[PDB]
Amino acid sequence: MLSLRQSIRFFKPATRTLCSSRYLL
């Protein structure tokens, strides 16, 4: 299967949070 990243920067996952948009930068 094609699923292998390369080099990771520490660990900091996060479940789905918020779900709206207003401004754009």
Next chain:
Amino acid sequence: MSWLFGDKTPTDDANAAVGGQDTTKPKELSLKQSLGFEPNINNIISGPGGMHVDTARLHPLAGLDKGVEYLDLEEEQLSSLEGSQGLIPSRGWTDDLCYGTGAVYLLGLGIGGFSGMMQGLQNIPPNSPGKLQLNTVLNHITKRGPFLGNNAGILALSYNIINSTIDALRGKHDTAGSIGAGALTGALFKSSKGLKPMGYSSAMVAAACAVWCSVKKRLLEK
């Protein structure tokens, strides 16, 4: 020197001592108690009133708004790399589609068309150069039924070594290089009515160990 006769009353002294305070308790309500106001007569004007104001209203509340902007915006940035739809990603045998074209499936069909020509070569007339040497058959028919020779059987082996190159170009995990043994005796018993042909056929499955062992870099060992 005697002002106790009843002289005029100076006002300059009245300003020095002009403070008073009949109420001494800490509660200042005693001042309104002189009026005797009632709660009922006051409830009549209890319409509008009793309210407050928001302090955060004057302050801007768009701070977290900048975080929600990149929250889902960047979350999909990397998702686009893999693909949101994902149509036929692996299908069980399409992993080479990322590092190849996927001839294992299609090319597998062309093999059934040529793999049969090996034995069918006797069913149809061959096109070898030299029709004079066949004068024996053109003169008269003599024994022309089914007949399997060995000179044509060995060709089935030379066809597997030339097709392994087109497949080796991909390279895949060894899966089970340790199972190569459980499959050996499985073929030894397949034949037991005389000379076992598997003796030379072993060289065919043996070459497969190299293609599968390819799982490791050949430079790492040599």
Next chain:
Amino acid sequence: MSWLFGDKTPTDDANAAVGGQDTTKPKELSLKQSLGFEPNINNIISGPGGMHVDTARLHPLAGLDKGVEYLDLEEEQLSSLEGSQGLIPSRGWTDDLCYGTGAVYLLGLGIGGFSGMMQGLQNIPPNSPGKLQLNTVLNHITKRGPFLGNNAGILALSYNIINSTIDALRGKHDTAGSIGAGALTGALFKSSKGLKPMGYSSAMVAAACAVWCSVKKRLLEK
């Protein structure tokens, strides 16, 4: 202005006066340079300076600071979300392992062992004791001619139908039901003109179309 008190005139009129007949200077702009009196030296102690103090200009704004954090945090969210443990036992050979076990590899070994006993049944002499010796004494048979050849031959066929069940529930495969044709004529030429095994051997590959076509078949899926 009272005459009895002799009020004095303040200097407010001299400042509010507009006319002026006391100045006796021939020039106030050209002579200003003769004494070296320029506005340059005065701009140092008379010109204003630069005063600017902002709290958002120096202090970091928690509002925009959140959009800068989710920039890399969100980009790494889906990135690391794809990797859970860091191992792929399926190896693209038994995707059902995630929702089953994946005996395709293991069972593949036990098959190579029994697949040989089929033809090696004659090489292995029966030495184990049987419990039907007393049952034969009642019939007493003396004509025991050899009749073993087609019983084990056709057995290799049913041995595949019983194995189609443990594999039928493997998972969801959609390889190629349209390729089943290119594989048919491939075995036709492999057979001979005399005894053609492709006639009964086809029923074996035909059954494979069901297990593979299983990719979609609610008509017989209750």
